[PDB]
């Protein structure tokens, strides 16, 4: 039994609960149940593995999950996405620092409470759906099968406060013929630590994050697969997910001409980069110095909608423009305090655009037992 509670500006109060049983009723299968609850998300999975199935280091794992997503509580245009599915994954260990994975996934997405907006309705139209633009009471259910691929390079010298090496994670999925949706999606994450001194007290850190996806054969990528930027983990100094396209709402009518907004919706393309200088903490050269890390950083990122038609909506910003790079700068503090790991940051978004929401003070604190 492992439990975890946390509080942060990105996800409010976070609860986690898990149980893992290596051998379930002498079957040899390792079974695990896990749960997560956010301000905006409720997630539950059933994990299955079996080390007696592993062949030449290639392992097989199963997953059965449920997910409840409330987009309004993630600072996005309001909608609800209740989903469930399964995943079967294979793990290939290439070497001591590189692993691969490939699996098949099924997912049922049940959408509701969609607040009519242009970009959202653009995807819906491409799927043959024609729900009213004057009401939030709506529904769209789909069933998809996917092929999932992943690569992880991890050569970081230490887990908690790395000082040398890099970590790269590349993931990709595509819909299989027969699915309701028709799209692909790629994500890339990189972290690189370079120590300048022998004691590794001074370290340069470069982070990047990329995402691109689009529909296939006339379709569009569903909006619930969008990428986001802005927040404690992406571009500090900005409110969570604020970076990128903003919703253009249709007018609401009672049961019997568009509106600009500052509500983010994400996009199908995304680019984020950060440079961070890790330094010693001033005047704490005692035993507590090893558990505290101070840093100065420069963050930037952009999100855009490749299928945004600026011609039909000339009165509104061009949300297909990839060149609206947002930037911020500030200082971060990391502490392995008694109450768990803590991260505090203060950043000033010196380059922002219309609709961006600032959040200079951001912090996350967790605790697991």
């Amino acid at each position: 039994f492992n439990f975890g509670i946390g509080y942060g500006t990105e996800s409010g109060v976070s609860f986690q609960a898990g149980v893992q049983q290596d051998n379930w009723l002498g079957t040899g299968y390792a079974v695990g149940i896990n749960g997560t609850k956010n301000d905006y998300q409720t997630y539950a999975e059933l994990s299955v593995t079996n080390p007696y199935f592993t062949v030449d280091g290639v392992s097989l794992g199963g997953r059965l999950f449920y997910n409840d997503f409330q987009a309004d509580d993630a600072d996005l245009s309001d909608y609800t996405n209740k989903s469930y599915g399964t995943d079967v994954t294979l793990g290939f260990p290439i070497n001591e620092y590189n692993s691969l994975r490939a699996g098949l996934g099924y997912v049922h997405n049940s959408l509701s409470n969609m607040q009519p907006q242009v970009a959202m309705w653009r995807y819906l139209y491409s799927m043959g759906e024609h729900p009213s633009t004057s009401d939030q009471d709506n529904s769209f259910k789909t069933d998809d099968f996917t092929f999932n691929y992943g690569w992880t390079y991890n050569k970081l010298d230490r887990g908690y406060f790395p000082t040398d090496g890099s970590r790269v994670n590349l993931t990709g999925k595509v819909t299989i013929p027969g699915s309701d949706n028709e799209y692909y999606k790629v994500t890339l994450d990189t972290a690189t630590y370079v120590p300048i001194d022998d004691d590794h007290k001074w370290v340069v850190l470069g982070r990047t994050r990329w995402g691109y996806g689009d529909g296939l054969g006339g379709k569009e990528m569903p909006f619930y697969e969008n990428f986001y930027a802005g927040g404690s983990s992406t571009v500090r100094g900005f409110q969570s997910n604020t970076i990128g396209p903003k919703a253009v709402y249709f007018p609401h009518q009672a049961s019997n001409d568009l509106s600009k907004s500052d509500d983010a919706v994400g996009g199908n393309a995304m680019a984020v980069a950060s440079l961070e200088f890790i330094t010693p903490t001033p005047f704490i050269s005692d035993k507590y110095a090893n558990s505290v890390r101070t840093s100065f950083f420069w963050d930037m990122g952009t999100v855009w909608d490749t299928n945004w038609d600026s011609s039909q909506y000339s009165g509104y910003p061009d949300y297909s423009d990839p060149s609206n790079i947002r930037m911020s700068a500030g200082i971060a503090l990391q502490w392995m305090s008694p109450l768990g790991p803590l991260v505090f940051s203060y950043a000033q978004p010196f380059k922002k655009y219309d609709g961006d929401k600032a959040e200079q003070f951001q912090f996350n604190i967790g605790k697991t037992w």
């Epitope: 309004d72 409470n113 607040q115």
Partner: nanobody, 121 residues
Framework: QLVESGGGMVQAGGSLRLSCAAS????????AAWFRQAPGKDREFVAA????????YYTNSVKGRFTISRDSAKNNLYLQMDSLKPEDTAVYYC????????????????WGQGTRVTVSA
């Protein structure tokens, strides 16, 4: 808790100003909205103001006649009701939300008790 005030009875054409406040609370980090329930009917969206406060959204029937706003300190939420019609007769409810705005009542987290507005021919 949310408390509405400013209702009553007015002849068609008149004006009203509804007010909503919460003791010791502010609307700083909240999306706020007004709903109304005409007799025999369901709660329907009237107007809303974004968390940022820079954007306002109205139902078509009241667009151009009603105005939702907040005071500088964000202690009070207002609905200016001009050019009243008989169909505007309803119990008006104040609502608040932590996330982005919506038009469905069940998407809002906190509600007032309602204040009655009657417009006579």
């Amino acid at each position: 808790q949310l408390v509405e005030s400013g209702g009553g009875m007015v002849q068609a054409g008149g004006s009203l100003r509804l007010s909503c406040a919460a003791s010791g609370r502010t609307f700083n980090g909240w999306t706020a909205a007004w709903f109304r329930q005409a007799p025999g009917k369901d709660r329907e969206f009237v107007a809303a103001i974004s968390r940022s406060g820079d954007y306002t959204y109205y139902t078509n029937s009241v667009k151009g006649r009603f105005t939702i706003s907040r005071d500088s300190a964000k202690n009070n939420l207002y609905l200016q009701m001009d050019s009243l019609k008989p169909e505007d007769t309803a119990v008006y409810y104040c609502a608040a939300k932590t996330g982005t705005w919506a038009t469905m009542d069940r998407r809002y987290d906190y509600w007032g008790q309602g204040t009655r507005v009657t417009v006579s021919a």
